[PDB]
Amino acid sequence: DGIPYRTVSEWLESIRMKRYILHFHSAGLDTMECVLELTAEDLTQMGITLPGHQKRILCSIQGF
Numbered sequence: 001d002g003i004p005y006r007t008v009s010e011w012l013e014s015i016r017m018k019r020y021i022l023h024f025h026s027a028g029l030d031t032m033e034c035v036l037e038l039t040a041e042d043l044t045q046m047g048i049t050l051p052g053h054q055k056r057i058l059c060s061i062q063g064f
Helices: 010-013 018-026 032-038 040-045 051-062
Strands: none
Touching: 010 018, 010 032, 040 051
């Protein structure tokens, strides 16, 4: 598996981005497996638009 978090929630808590939990559920991103291919364009369309926040989420994913 190799993903260091069990749930999108626990993952988001870890990077202090749990404010965006509802955004992930809205986009039907409910398991960790779903988040692996996110780009900045996908985050934008999720309504996660701030660069800093994108960087935070995307680096975390590369870091898995």
